[PDB]
């Protein structure tokens, strides 16, 4: 009989890489760095 199909090995499609979305936190940090000027004391 002829040779079967070669199973080259694992199915590398299962691999995947997430993507981090911390723009909320970075925007909050910049908003706080700008709002701390509303907390400076001026006697």
């Amino acid at each position: 009989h002829t040779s079967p199909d070669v199973d080259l090995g694992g199915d590398i499609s299962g691999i995947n890489a997430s993507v981090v979305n911390i723009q909320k936190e970075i925007d909050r940090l910049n908003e706080v760095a700008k709002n701390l000027n509303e907390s400076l004391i001026d006697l």
């Binding site: 590398i12 909050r28 706080v32």
Partner: protein
């Protein structure tokens, strides 16, 4: 009165810095989760690639063996 001003604005500043530290904590947590995910993914890729390439090696070896058998 000036002491009340200092106290109120210091409380406001500490509240804003609490919000900033909570935001930095959440951001570092998400970055940790994502970098660890990507690291595990790259390690999985490395291992399973090693496997697939070893398989390819064996396949090409048998190929060359059959060729030598013919020639």
């Amino acid at each position: 009165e000036n002491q009340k001003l200092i106290a109120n604005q210091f409380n406001s500043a500490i509240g804003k810095i609490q919000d900033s530290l909570s935001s930095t904590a959440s951001a570092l947590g998400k970055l940790q989760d994502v970098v660890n995910h990507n690291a595990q993914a790259l390690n999985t890729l490395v291992k399973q690639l090693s496997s697939k390439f070893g398989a390819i090696s064996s396949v090409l070896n048998d190929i060359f063996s059959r060729l030598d058998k013919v020639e």
